[PDB]
Amino acid sequence: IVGGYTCGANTVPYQVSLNSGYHFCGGSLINSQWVVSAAHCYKSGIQVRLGEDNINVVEGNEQFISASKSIVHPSYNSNTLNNDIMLIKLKSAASLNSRVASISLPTSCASAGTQCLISGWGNTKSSGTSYPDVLKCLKAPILSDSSCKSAYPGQITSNMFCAGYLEGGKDSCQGDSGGPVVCSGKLQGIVSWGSGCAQKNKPGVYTKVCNYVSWIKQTIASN
Numbered sequence: 468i469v470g471g472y473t474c475g476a477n478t479v480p481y482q483v484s485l486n487s488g489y490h491f492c493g494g495s496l497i498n499s500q501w502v503v504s505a506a507h508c509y510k511s512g513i514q515v516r517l518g519e520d521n522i523n524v525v526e527g528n529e530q531f532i533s534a535s536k537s538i539v540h541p542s543y544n545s546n547t548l549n550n551d552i553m554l555i556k557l558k559s560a561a562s563l564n565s566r567v568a569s570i571s572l573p574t575s576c577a578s579a580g581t582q583c584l585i586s587g588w589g590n591t592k593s594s595g596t597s598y599p600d601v602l603k604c605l606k607a608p609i610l611s612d613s614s615c616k617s618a619y620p621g622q623i624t625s626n627m628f629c630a631g632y633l634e635g636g637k638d639s640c641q642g643d644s645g646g647p648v649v650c651s652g653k654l655q656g657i658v659s660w661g662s663g664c665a666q667k668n669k670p671g672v673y674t675k676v677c678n679y680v681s682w683i684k685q686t687i688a689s690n
């Protein structure tokens with residue numbers, strides 16, 4: 468997260484870290500046994516880390532649970548990043564509390580102008596690299612479809628939306644991949660891609676979760 472603020476320990480209780488010996492992606496807890504992330508975060512041997520603030524220090528509220536199964540969306544296209552969403556089933560159910568909690572799926576799609584919360588442990592600089600150890604937060608609005616398509620001609624599908632600031636300076640970044648975009652208490656987006664980070668006229672692009680609720684519910688019910 469570039470240009471954000473320190474969230475505060477366990478103030479984003481649905482945020483997960485995906486760990487394969489090191490943090491490599493974010494995710495969102497959607498019930499006690501399932502996590503949603505980006506398909507471009509796929510790999511084998513994932514450990515899901517819940518209840519994290521400082522990802523380099525054991526602070527006492529963590530739960531570490533291995534993944535038993537990962538399911539990439541059947542239509543994910545790694546060249547265009549269309550359908551950039553994946554589900555991860557935990558080997559055992561998390562213990563839910565005030566600091567580890569699930570986030571609700573949306574019943575409708577959020578409109579442009581809605582303010583949302585984006586969070587992650589990704590790069591905090593738009594040039595160079597500096598990775599924080601504690602969770603960062605950013606409040607940002609959803610942008611109109613026309614501004615999004617004007618920023619990225621020929622690249623925005625119906626399964627993507629833009630959020631952020633056309634002036635630059637505030638954005639998600641590498642390492643935030645797969646993490647949540649939460650608006651009005653519902654999961655509306657997944658950190659997916661962008662051109663650089665926090666560049667002028669290049670806002671972040673997010674997977675449009677409301678298009679996938681039926682696939683998520685059917686998949687969870689059968690696996």
Ligand SMILES: N=C(N)c1ccc(Br)cc1
Nearest residue numbers: 639640660661663664671
């Ligand atoms: N929002 C961005 N600018 C961005 C997000 C994820 C990745 Br990976 C790269 C860039």
Ligand SMILES: [Ca+2]
Nearest residue numbers: 521524525526
């Ligand atoms: Ca920790």
